[PDB]
Amino acid sequence: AEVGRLRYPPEMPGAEVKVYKKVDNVDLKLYIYKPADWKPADRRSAIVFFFGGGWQSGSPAQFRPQCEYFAGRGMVAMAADYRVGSRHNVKVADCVADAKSAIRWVRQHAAELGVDPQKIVASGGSAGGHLAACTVMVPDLEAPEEDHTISSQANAAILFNPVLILSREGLKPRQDWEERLRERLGTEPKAVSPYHHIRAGLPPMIIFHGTADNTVPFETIRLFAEAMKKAGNRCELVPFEGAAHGFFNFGRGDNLAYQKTLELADEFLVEIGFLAPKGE
Ligand SMILES: [Cl-]
Ligand SMILES: [Cl-]
């Protein structure tokens, strides 16, 4: 509900604004937070957050607090806008293209951003967590007007109650439901279903999910994580006992889950060599 009251477009005080994509006569922006000691020539890790809201609504403001945290730790942290149903009459596949365009843009512009182009983390909540996962493991579905010699693939992901299974193929593949998914998603459902793209050799990830989630059942995420681990990938699943969809957000449950998810995300980033340990 609180997340639902966020402003669009957001103020994002202290952020630098860059347009990463011009599409359908809208300028899609990144809201960029740099560390206090940032200099051109830096080669910092970066994180790009994609807001939640069912691919229908939401605001980059959702992840402003996390951006401020990670910029405090020395990352170039940013929150991306992307097209949504209520504002732009797009479908899920369009959202995925925008998320991929954002990672591509950060990589293309890594030098001027003071960023290491092989340390770009994709992150998000719910629908935005789906997008982040798509940037790590789903093939590009379109080639927009952008540098396709530059990869859209993120180097790691941090997912907050993501949607990871968008097709029922290979679960316990009924036709009419997959056809309804096709019309909603703008493509074959498997083409935007991270679970259907599990293979060896993928970037590392951490996932935070409530065990009492009625929106995205925890069991879908357990299945995902088990299969990823079977494929040899680093896929850390942190259950939040009794928590529901949206539990991790700044401003709810006394900020306890907010703080805990940041702590664990920080250690994950140290583990994979994207952040220096807090001990310096
Ligand atoms: Cl790895
Ligand atoms: Cl829920």
**What distances in angstroms separate CA 38 from CA 83, 108, 148, one per listed residue?**
30, 19, 29
Joined tokens for residue 17: 């604004």
243 CA distance to ligand 2 middle (Å): 8
Give residue 219 CA to ligand 1 midpoint distance, Å.
23
Residues in contact with 277: Cβ distance below 8 Å, sequence separation at least 6, in sequence order: 270
d(CA 98, CA 205): 21
Domain ranges in the chain?
A: 1-280
Gap from CA of 271 to ligand 1 centroid (Å): 10
Cα of 64 vs centre of ligand 1, distance in Å, is 28
Q: Which ligand is nearest to the CA of 271?
A: 1
Q: What is the Å distance from ligand 2's center to 61 Cα?
A: 21
- 8 Å CB contact between 224 and 193: no
The closest alpha carbon to 105, from 65, 165, 145, belongs to 145
Contact 154, 131 (CB under 8 A): no
Q: How far is the CA of 118 from the centre of ligand 2 (A)?
A: 35
Tokens describing residue 239: 């259950």
In CATH, which of 3.40.50.1820, 3.40.190.10, 1.10.10.10, 3.40.50.620 is domain 1-280?
3.40.50.1820
Separation of 85 CA from ligand 1 center, angstroms?
Answer: 35
Burial 129-147 (b: 16+ CB within 10 A, else e): bbbbbbbbbbebbeeeebe
3-state secondary structure of 213: coil
What is the spatial order of strands in the sheet that 44-50 belongs to?
16-23, 26-33, 76-80, 44-50, 115-125, 156-160, 205-210, 235-240
Method: X-ray
Q: What is the resolution of this structure in A?
A: 1.6
Give the up-direction half-sphere exposure of residue 134: CA atoms within 13 A in the CB hemisphere: 33
Q: Counting ligands in written order, which one lies closest to the CA of residue 161?
A: 2
β-pairing verdict for 115-125 and 16-23 = unpaired
Q: How far is the CA of 184 from the centre of ligand 1 (A)?
A: 33
Look at the alpha carbons of 92, 95, 97, 103 in this order and tell me if their dihedral is positive or negative: negative
Query: What are the residues facing 235 on neighbouring strands?
Result: 205
> Near ion ligand 2, which residues have CB within 5 Å?
213-215, 244-245
CB atoms within 10 A of CB 36: 7
Q: Ligand 2 centre and the CA of 11: distance in Å? A: 28
Q: Ligand 2 center to residue 214 CA distance, Å?
A: 4
Q: How far apart, in whole angstroms, are the C-alpha atoms of residue 106 and residue 98?
A: 12
Residue 233 CA, ligand 1 centroid: distance in Å: 6
Q: How far is the CA of 33 from the centre of ligand 2 (A)?
A: 31
**How many Å lie between the centroid of ligand 1 and the Cα of residue 205?**
8
Distance 200 CA to ligand 1 centre (A): 10
Q: Is the dihedral of CA 49, 52, 55, 56 positive or negative?
A: negative
Q: Residue 239 Cα, ligand 1 centroid: separation in angstroms?
A: 21
Instruction: Indicate the burial class of 42 (C-beta count within 10 angstroms; 0-12, 13-18, 19 or more).
Output: middle
Ligand nearest to the CA of 209: 2
What's the 131 CA to ligand 1 centre distance in angstroms?
A: 20
